[PDB]
Amino acid sequence: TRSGYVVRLAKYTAYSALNYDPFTMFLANDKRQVRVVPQTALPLVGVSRGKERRP
Amino acid sequence: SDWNLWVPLGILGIPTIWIALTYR
Amino acid sequence: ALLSFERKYRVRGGTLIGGDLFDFWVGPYFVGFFGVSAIFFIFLGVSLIGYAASQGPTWDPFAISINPPDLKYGLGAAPLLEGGFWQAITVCALGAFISWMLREVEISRKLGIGWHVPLAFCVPIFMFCVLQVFRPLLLGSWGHAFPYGILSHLDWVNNFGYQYLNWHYNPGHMSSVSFLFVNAMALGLHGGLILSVANPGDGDKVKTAEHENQYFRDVVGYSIGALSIHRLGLFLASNIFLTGAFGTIASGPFWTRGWPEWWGWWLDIPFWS
Amino acid sequence: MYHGALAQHLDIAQLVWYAQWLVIWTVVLLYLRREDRREGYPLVEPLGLVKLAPEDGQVYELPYPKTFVLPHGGTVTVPRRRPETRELKLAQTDGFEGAPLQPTGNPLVDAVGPASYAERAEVVDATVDGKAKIVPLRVATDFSIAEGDVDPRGLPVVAADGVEAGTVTDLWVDRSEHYFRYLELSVAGSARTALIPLGFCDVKKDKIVVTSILSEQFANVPRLQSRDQITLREEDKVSAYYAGGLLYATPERAESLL
Amino acid sequence: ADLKPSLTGLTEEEAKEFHGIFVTSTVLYLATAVIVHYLVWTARPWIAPIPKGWV
Amino acid sequence: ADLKPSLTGLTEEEAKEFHGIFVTSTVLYLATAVIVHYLVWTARPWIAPIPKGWV
Amino acid sequence: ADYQTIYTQIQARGPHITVSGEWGDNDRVGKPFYSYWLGKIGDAQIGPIYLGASGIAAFAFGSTAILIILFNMAAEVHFDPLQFFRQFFWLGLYPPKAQYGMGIPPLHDGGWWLMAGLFMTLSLGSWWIRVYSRARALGLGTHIAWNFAAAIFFVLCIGCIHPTLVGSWSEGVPFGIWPHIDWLTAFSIRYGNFYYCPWHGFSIGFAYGCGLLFAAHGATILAVARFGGDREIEQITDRGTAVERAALFWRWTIGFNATIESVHRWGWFFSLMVMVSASVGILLTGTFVDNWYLWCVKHGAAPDYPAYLPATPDPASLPGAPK
Amino acid sequence: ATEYRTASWKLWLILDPRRVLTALFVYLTVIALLIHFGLLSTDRLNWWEFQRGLPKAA
Amino acid sequence: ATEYRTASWKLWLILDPRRVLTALFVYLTVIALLIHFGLLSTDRLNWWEFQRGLPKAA
Amino acid sequence: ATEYRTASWKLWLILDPRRVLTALFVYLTVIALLIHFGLLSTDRLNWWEFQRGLPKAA
Amino acid sequence: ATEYRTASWKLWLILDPRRVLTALFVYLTVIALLIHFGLLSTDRLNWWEFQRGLPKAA
Amino acid sequence: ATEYRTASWKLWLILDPRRVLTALFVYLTVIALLIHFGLLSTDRLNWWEFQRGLPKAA
Amino acid sequence: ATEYRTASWKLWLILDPRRVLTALFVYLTVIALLIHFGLLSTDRLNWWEFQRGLPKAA
């Protein structure tokens, strides 16, 4: 039942509307980094603009 | 190049003519 | 020390408690019994903060904090440095607030105006009481209340909210937030509209009440009307806390799951599930 | 190497912070607060010592004057010097700066404390057309009560005593707001109509209850100059009388609860 | 008030001159639409026959 | 009041002067469009024939 | 109680007078009707409405936007009508999920997002013009327009400007009830906690400020409504007992007062400032500060607390840690 | 009537061209947009794009 | 009544063509849309798309 | 009429140039934007950019 | 009353046909939808779809 | 009264048919809904579906 | 008309320069900006930067 996807997803993440399946992203394999927050006060030159940056 | 892809000419063209002709 | 028109209004009486002995103005301030009382708390409470902050680990104004006692102390008194002063201040606080509010009542009595102001001021007081007193009673510890500290207090707000997994979804919050926004927008419009009519630019004549009406009935097609906006303002403002108070009290005593899970009621009606 | 770094400890955010502050205070002080002193300033002194200048920093204080060009002719200049020359019937408790005052005679008639009015311009309030704004329903014949409400015309006006003061003659309407401002009642015992603000009476199904003043003092509600229109000053006069009664109707209204 | 625009009405004659054109032009449009639909059909025949599985 | 401009009608002539230009330029606009659509076709023949799989 | 401040007891009906504009007296639209219930809190009469060009346009773009939004939301539930209606708050139109920098993203990943964005932008503007023009049409001042302006600008900041300065559309707010909110958290997590950004501070200050101020102004007027203090404009030009009292009240309490006119300025100023403060913060973020907390620690503003349970060294940094 | 068979036309006495015209304009445009959009959201029947349909292929 | 059987027609004296016409117009459009979309939400009975139905196959 | 065939012109009596013009102007603007941007967010029929299409290539 | 047995009919002097008519119209419509859609959200009694009801089968 | 036994009827002089009618309409509808849906949310006592009950079965 | 062929000029009677003129100003400014910016968002057709285009080169 194709219409039910969103709900199938929500119930997995505590009923929030977040749109990612975190099993397949983080748990199935070691391919992603969980850490997203920068470890410095100011934007570090060379990783902080455009296609250098993460989404 | 439009080969039996008259389609847009059809849509664009047909009304263009009867617009010209109905309101005189 | 007086406004040009002030004198005719400065008459005796209309104190709630203890008559004539406190019925005087210091400068522009009217004192009264509650004046005195307020001051006393303010002075003591503030001093107490200072002393307490002195035996902290910093003096950065943002970084200073007076925290409440651990959860083990229950609803009892704690050692003075291990949460006691917190307790102290909280009372001086309440003290000050209430004395403030009553003073206002005395003032309004003296002027023969309505008591709307004091009462309106009662709403936030209540929310303070809700957060510092009731909710902690219901969970049975003072340690559930928030600490006094500019940045410190926010840390409390922050963690509290992540204790239910995403506070944004808590329906009390939703309502309160909506009001907060409407209120702000509405103040803007009310502000502007008066000002536009008064100061119409150039040597244009000041406009009439009808122009206020026309203006809105043009832009959005309805005009709430002049008195009622005032009335309505008061209403919006007030439900910021009135509705929120519900969401606040709920979290912990009446709900222990994440707030999103609560919308399950709708999401899960078995008909269309 | 970092974006937004002015030194090894100084960053553009940090500077902006102060900047922001600066503006706020400036606006507040060098503007808003000045705008606030358009009424009732400069400050007056009836005890203190040789002072033509408020809290200090402030005799600039007053902003330079505006000039409101009014809708139906004329100009007003703000701030002004509007002098109070009514001679107040108030004796002082002490000669002291901020010690309160005692009314000498009847405070409700001598118009002091909550019973004091402002000396407004002695003209009729007007519509955008040039008609009178506030009129009774004898005059505004086009206007009417909404179907579904109680017409208070005919009802008994009961005062603070529990005694019928008189009966309702009319309602008065604001023509430019579609709103009722006054009840005009017929004070029983005399041959007079007095005007009560609608904010001083709880209208019921059977009666109009007036907590403000006592039955006997309806006899002394300020008299209207004309019969069918009301000036701006007369409005203030009428309103102040009842409100003054909230402190002066009974002797106990003075006193504190204990 | 004893007329159709009875004693200075805000004005609309017995104009079915409008009705004429309205109906003409509405039909032209529906015709053109058919012609068009035919053409597109030849480019992308859209309904499809019932497949091997179905039912 | 028994006319088109019957006792100050609020200011529009019998102007088919406007009907004139309006219909003129409506055609030019559509004309130009056809031409232009043709040129583009030669640069990017957009609809495409049906692929080997399809149906 | 005094009932006359809470609701209206006796309602009035009669002929409403139209103020003739500078232009477009003609483009007022609809039969004005009454609502007796609404009449208990404000004017009962509900029509007409001005139309004119700006309107037309605003609606034009606005609707297109809405359409694109909804349509894509439908497409998320695969057009099942029942499910749509059940799942509606959880549905949204999202910006791009891959990193394309600032390139116009593919239709299926953020493309449609962008289009709706542009159209929403355009409606806002068209509307702005409406507000501003109408004012000028009726010989009023332009204050409302300018307040409204700031609001719009802040929308711009979080919509495209910020994305731009950091140079990725990925940072856009999504359309949809819940999902516009999920944005808030993500965004905050990413920039190292927004409670610690000073402009978030300012903003909130002013916002609560508005609360305080309206409650106060609101309450004040009602308290003096008995003297006809709700007639705010005549009070400006010819000061009556009403506002004399109102002033006195505040003076005797906090020790300084306003005027009937200037209180409006204060309110107008506070309102404005919410939006401005916000905009600044947004602009600074990502561009000059990467992690607001760490920044507050570099300037020692951040409070520090002792450990309750034992302090925990990050496992990543141990000898012989995995990845 | 000018050689009419039915009263049909009397509709315009009742209804108002202006409202009808303007409504149709909108109505049609919406339906039009919907259909267009819905088409360009498929995999058959998206012109404007390489056949991502993977028609049967794989 | 011009050669009539019932009074039915009197309804138009009570109800008002304009209301009815307009509302029908809307009502129908809705239902129409509901069905259309609803159908194109399935697997059997979607035209506009490849047979994703996987009718039984696998 | 100045040597016409139809009443067509009379529309401008009923309808109003100003509003028609102003509308059309917005309307066409909307559509033009839709088309341009929509196009430039494809892979075929993007001019402006290098052929990202990877038409079959790869 | 034209050979009527009851007074039933006087109801329309009390009630207002226009309200009744309009209410039923809506009322019914809704129930109808509930039933349709609700049915088509089961596994048995869904026409429109393949029997992914998998009735007992597997 | 036309051949009555009680005065029951006088109720309608007091109470108002239209209120009672409109209320009952609603009241019963709601109750009806509660029961219907309520039932169809069980395991026993759901028509409309395959026997989810697993009645004793496992 | 001062040696004119069309009535076209009458548009200014109907339309008002002040408005036309000003709106145009805005309009044009927007389109300008959209294009300029849009362009400098690409890789081909961005001046103001090195050829990030990596035109085929990597």
Ligand code: BCB
């Ligand atoms: C991660 C956690 C979050 C969170 C956690 C949260 C909690 C736990 C609570 C709220 C609450 C509220 N939140 Mg939320 N919040 C809100 C807005 C709001 C407010 C509408 C509302 C009430 C604020 C309050 O309690 O005042 C407090 C003000 C008080 C108590 C009055 C103090 C005034 C006092 C009487 C007088 C003081 C006088 C001074 C001492 C005098 C000193 C001055 C000088 C002159 C001497 C917005 C708009 C957002 C956005 C935009 O995201 C947001 C996000 C969040 N909130 C985050 C998601 N929020 C409250 C609420 O209502 O929840 C439903 C609340 O409990």
Ligand code: BCB
């Ligand atoms: C976990 C995340 C949090 C968070 C995340 C956050 C972010 C990221 C931002 C804020 C911002 C703000 N926060 Mg915060 N927040 C706030 C309150 C505020 C506001 C004062 C300010 C946002 C400006 C605003 O009013 O938006 C409402 C007003 C808006 C959106 C303007 C709308 C006007 C527009 C013209 C509307 C008209 C639209 C049209 C009708 C169009 C219709 C659409 C069609 C076309 C489809 C409170 C009171 C709290 C509490 C009590 O905790 C809190 C906590 C949090 N915030 C949590 C910590 N907040 C902003 C800010 O100030 O940052 C520095 C901001 O960017």
Ligand SMILES: C/C=C1/c2cc3[nH]c4c(c3C)C(=O)[C@H](C(=O)OC)c4c3nc(cc4[nH]c(cc(n2)[C@@H]1C)c(C(C)=O)c4C)[C@@H](C)[C@@H]3CCC(=O)OC/C=C(\C)CCC[C@H](C)CCC[C@@H](C)CCCC(C)C
């Ligand atoms: C919905 C209803 C809204 C609303 C309504 C109204 N608001 C009013 C009134 C109305 C009607 C008044 O009539 C009254 C007033 O006079 O008009 C100016 C008032 C006032 N609202 C103030 C602050 C205010 N309003 C807030 C919120 C809303 N207002 C909501 C939004 C907030 C928020 C939201 O944070 C703040 C900070 C003061 C300026 C002023 C009272 C001074 C006082 O209370 O004197 C007495 C006390 C002092 C002067 C100092 C107290 C020192 C104590 C003893 C100990 C130190 C404090 C300790 C508790 C540490 C905490 C700090 C920590 C968090 C880091």
Ligand SMILES: C/C=C1/c2cc3[nH]c4c(c3C)C(=O)[C@H](C(=O)OC)c4c3nc(cc4[nH]c(cc(n2)[C@@H]1C)c(C(C)=O)c4C)[C@@H](C)[C@@H]3CCC(=O)OC/C=C(\C)CCC[C@H](C)CCC[C@@H](C)CCCC(C)C
């Ligand atoms: C501190 C400063 C505050 C502030 C200030 C101010 N805020 C203002 C003004 C000022 C000064 C105005 O002057 C202006 C206005 O005029 O108000 C009277 C306005 C506004 N702020 C609105 C909403 C708002 N303010 C918010 C916030 C703050 N504001 C902040 C907090 C928020 C939040 C917080 O979310 C919200 C939601 C709107 C009322 C209004 C925009 C109208 C518009 O821009 O129109 C744009 C036009 C549309 C979206 C078209 C509508 C199309 C319809 C729905 C049909 C679509 C259906 C379609 C599928 C099919 C078509 C068929 C169809 C026939 C069916």
Ligand SMILES: CC(C)=CCC/C(C)=C/CC/C(C)=C\CC/C(C)=C/CC/C(C)=C/CC/C(C)=C\CC/C(C)=C/CC/C(C)=C/CC/C(C)=C/CC1=C(C)C(=O)c2ccccc2C1=O
């Ligand atoms: C000289 C002499 C004899 C000396 C010896 C005597 C001696 C030493 C005696 C003993 C002293 C004693 C016993 C006592 C000391 C005095 C005393 C009682 C002090 C209390 C003082 C105290 C704690 C003061 C702090 C003031 C305070 C709490 C807050 C400051 C105000 C703040 C921050 C307000 C928020 C900002 C804000 C909303 C500003 C709004 C602007 C204004 C003015 C809003 C109010 C306002 C509104 C809202 C209107 O609607 C309005 C409508 C129409 C006209 C006017 C107004 C108006 O003014």
Ligand SMILES: COC1=C(OC)C(=O)C(C/C=C(/C)CC/C=C(/C)CC/C=C(\C)CC/C=C(\C)CC/C=C(/C)CC/C=C(\C)CC/C=C(\C)CC/C=C(\C)CCC=C(C)C)=C(C)C1=O
């Ligand atoms: C006079 O000059 C002026 C005018 O006239 C010329 C104007 O018209 C105007 C303004 C022009 C206008 C058109 C004004 C209209 C502008 C507006 C923003 C009006 C819009 C207001 C709303 C949409 C209402 C807000 C509703 C929301 C934000 C949604 C909230 C969502 C939920 C779920 C709320 C749930 C809870 C509730 C709805 C109510 C809860 C209430 C309680 C729990 C308790 C209630 C408390 C009371 C009743 C008070 C206590 C009772 C007494 C004290 C007697 C101005 C500015 C000007 O001043």
Ligand SMILES: COC1=C(OC)C(=O)C(C/C=C(/C)CC/C=C(\C)CC/C=C(\C)CC/C=C(\C)CC/C=C(/C)CC/C=C(\C)CC/C=C(\C)CC/C=C(/C)CCC=C(C)C)=C(C)C1=O
């Ligand atoms: C002459 O000098 C003085 C003045 O003039 C200068 C004064 O005005 C005043 C002021 C005195 C007044 C009564 C002012 C008028 C009264 C009011 C305005 C009402 C508001 C007053 C209050 C809310 C509290 C005042 C009463 C007290 C502080 C009594 C203290 C009671 C106790 C049990 C203290 C002993 C501590 C314990 C037994 C430990 C266990 C108790 C706790 C842990 C509670 C603390 C935690 C909380 C959340 C507090 C919440 C409870 C409350 C706020 C009542 C004083 C005291 C002074 O003498």
Ligand code: HEC
């Ligand atoms: C059971 C323990 C646990 C709980 C509960 C938990 N987290 Fe985490 N969280 C972690 C761990 C472990 C990591 C780091 C994982 C890694 O190194 O890959 C983490 C990482 C994070 C990060 C990334 C920090 C960074 O360095 O970029 C955020 C943000 C976060 N958590 C937020 C949350 C939120 C919000 C919740 C509650 C909803 C939550 N966490 C609940 C263990 C937990």
Ligand SMILES: CC(C)=CCC/C(C)=C/C=C/C(C)=C/C=C/C(C)=C/C=C/C=C(C)/C=C/C=C(\C)CC/C=C(\C)CCCC(C)C
């Ligand atoms: C005297 C008078 C004033 C002067 C004359 C006035 C003049 C000249 C009038 C003539 C000029 C003009 C502009 C005439 C215009 C006539 C027009 C526009 C007729 C339009 C008819 C439009 C029709 C019939 C539209 C029917 C639309 C439908 C049936 C849509 C159905 C949609 C569905 C079933 C859902 C499908 C959705 C899906 C996703 C599959």
Ligand SMILES: CC(C)=CCC/C(C)=C/C=C/C(C)=C/C=C/C(C)=C/C=C/C=C(C)/C=C/C=C(\C)CC/C=C(\C)CCCC(C)C
């Ligand atoms: C006042 C008078 C005296 C002076 C006279 C002065 C003059 C001559 C004024 C008139 C001169 C001018 C400027 C006339 C202009 C006439 C114009 C602009 C006519 C325009 C007609 C435009 C039409 C018919 C547009 C039809 C558009 C559509 C059908 C679009 C359909 C779009 C879709 C189906 C979806 C595409 C979107 C997608 C696939 C994402």
Ligand SMILES: CC(C)=CCC/C(C)=C/C=C/C(C)=C/C=C/C(C)=C/C=C\C=C(C)\C=C\C=C(/C)CC/C=C(\C)CCCC(C)C
């Ligand atoms: C240079 C190039 C190529 C492009 C530039 C494009 C550009 C200007 C981008 C900037 C975009 C901006 C400003 C984006 C802003 C996005 C924002 C702020 C979104 C925020 C919130 C949206 C929310 C909460 C909306 C949710 C919407 C819905 C649930 C559906 C919409 C429907 C309604 C509101 C109801 C009305 C419909 C009813 C009549 C049937």
Ligand SMILES: CCCCCCCCCCCC[N+](C)(C)[O-]
């Ligand atoms: C964080 C936002 C708060 C901004 C500060 C508000 C200004 C308060 C007004 C003080 C008035 C000073 N005074 C007594 C000279 O008038």
Ligand SMILES: CCCCCCCCCCCC[N+](C)(C)[O-]
């Ligand atoms: C109200 C928001 C709190 C955050 C404000 C940050 C304060 C900076 C001033 C502290 C001095 C230290 N500094 C900046 C030189 O490093």
Ligand SMILES: [Fe+3]
């Ligand atoms: Fe006001």
